[PDB]
Design a protein around this ligand. Sequence first.
Ligand SMILES: COc1cc(C(=O)NC2CCN(C)CC2)ccc1Nc1cc2c(cn1)c(C)nn2-c1cc(Cl)cc(CCC(N)=O)c1
Length: 261
Amino acid sequence: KEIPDVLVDPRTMKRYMRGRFLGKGGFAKCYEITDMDTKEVFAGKVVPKSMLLKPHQKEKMSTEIAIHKSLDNPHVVGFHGFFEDDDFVYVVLEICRRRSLLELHKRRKAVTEPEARYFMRQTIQGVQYLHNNRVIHRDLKLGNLFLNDDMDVKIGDFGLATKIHSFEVDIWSLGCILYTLLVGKPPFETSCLKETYIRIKKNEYSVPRHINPVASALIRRMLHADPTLRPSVAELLTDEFFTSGYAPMRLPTSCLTVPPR
Ligand SMILES: COc1cc(C(=O)NC2CCN(C)CC2)ccc1Nc1cc2c(cn1)c(C)nn2-c1cc(Cl)cc(CCC(N)=O)c1
């Protein structure tokens, strides 16, 4: 069924012009949507009610919206109102024109140490906000760390997020990200899906000899078997890793394809 070329709502009564396709995400599709009056551009999640015919799944999205709506931080994807018609459910969000930290990883492999410091810092700060406000993200990944024209990390995607395992699962995801950034391959990545689950359970990984000792230290603790021995969000920024070597305040857009000089 056709998705309308213009998008209007009974609430705000603003008109959104359906522009260019941006990508898929399960049952969700994203389009660059423009406000027809202000000319302000947004990322519009469009989910059909045909995928939301079930009362069970319909909760997941109304839980996610409720949590995203309450958020306002310079490191979390800006929530900007949701609505629905008979056919589709629409979510209006902050536009991040530089795709995600996944695309960066795939194109760069192992980033330089000062880059990962920067990306981690900005990411961790948003995770602090979340954690301060009783929110656990539960699904932090590179695909979820969105990048804008200023190379600013903005955490999105709360499909599996909850409000109050506890907070220290988010600290684990962050360990993975830091690993994948510094090393260039995910720490538990394998071809077989079931194998991956075993690796996690048994805690099977090894940080290569080539990685900085201080860096491999922070990684190991963020990945520690005992969740209660993982560092708290606040304890991360203060770590030697962020405070030892160079930590740039801004990154060029060139970092998307080539290392900075
Ligand atoms: C304007 O900046 C963007 C560009 C693109 C893009 O160029 N995608 C290419 C288009 C061509 N096809 C062949 C491959 C992906 C994609 C997303 C952009 N921005 C952009 C995307 C955004 C957001 C903000 N801003 C938010 C918030 N959530 N999402 C979001 C949401 C979903 Cl459901 C899926 C994806 C996915 C993946 C993908 N294919 O890259 C992203």
